[model samples]
Target: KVFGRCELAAAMKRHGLDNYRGYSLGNWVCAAKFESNFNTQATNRNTDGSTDYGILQINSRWWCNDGRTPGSRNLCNIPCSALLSSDITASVNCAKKIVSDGNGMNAWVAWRNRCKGTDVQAWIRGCRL
Candidate 1:
């Protein structure tokens, strides 16, 4: 399922992404916009052969196991398939683990490149918290 900006923001906020590790809800939603376009089924294969999955684009390298990545840690102990599920909760949980285990919000290159320190109010504009 794909979600609009407001709905993605609401869902991430409900999943504890609001102010999670100092990364605001805007940061999360903004990253989602660029990473997966709020689509639950988005997947990207990296040059290194690891794939990224989910609205947050959790990586198969260190986060989830896809059974095909050359060498992966599967730190989140979840299958990459879980990240593509209709519900964003699995992705949210995996992302939470990513931030705690690695960089705060800097883990996602898209977040660092686009959402970092930018005005993200528009990401959630005209939406209720």
Candidate 2:
């Protein structure tokens, strides 16, 4: 929903994270559901007095300035630190680039594999994102 034409599915296509080759949208969605429950606006309180926010769960202190407010940055900038404060889609897009080293979807695919259960991994093998 946060995503437009560049929806999660489209983002997957742009980055090639969800590929017909050993990966699928379902596979990625499974990971998303587990991570943020598809709520790109997700946030959590950590035990270390920190906050993990946004769809990709960018650390409030790490991504944004330690003392800065969230959404302080613009949505389209590379820093799109707005990701930490607002616009899950922008945050996720930036995440995709960071993870992939500009490779895009492969980064997402790798992240999916990172948190995947054995069954999820097995399912990924047959997926076609």
Candidate 3:
């Protein structure tokens, strides 16, 4: 899905993820921005031979299966394409599961390298929600 920052934030809030699992909404939005620029269909192949999926760029090696890799943990139990849909519900749920698994946003390299400890208000800056 191609979401403007405010729209994404509002959807996240509606899904009960604004302050989920001790991570701020800013962090989530910032991570999405840096990872995929809020495009749900985004995918990236990493040098480690694993692919990242959707807006949050959840990894195929441990989170979801892309069918290109064998022995994937597929912890989310959902196909990687499910995350690429315009509807972000599945992706958001999977992200929550990831955070609940104790990785928090640390699971995302973009979050660790950029969003973490940053002032992320600009992520939701123009959105009145």
Best by lDDT: 1
Looking at candidate 2, what is the lDDT of residue 109? 45
Tens digits of per-residue lDDT, candidate 2, 31-65, equal 55555655666667666665655556555444443
| Ten-residue region with minimum lDDT total, candidate 1 | 94-103
TM-scores vs. true structure, each candidate? 0.95, 0.49, 0.93
lDDT of each: 0.88, 0.50, 0.87
Over 1-129, each residue of candidate 1 has an lDDT whose tens digit, in order, gives 999888888888888989888777888889999999889999989999999998899989898999999778888898999999989989999888888865788899998999888997778888888
Segments in model 3 whose C-alpha atoms lie over 4 Å from true places: none
lDDT of 3 by residue, 1-129 (tens): 689888889988888888898777788889988899999989889887899999989889988988887777899999899999888898999999999986677888888999787788767777877
Question: Quick one: how many clashes does candidate 3 have?
Answer: 0
Error of 2 at 58 (Å): 1.6
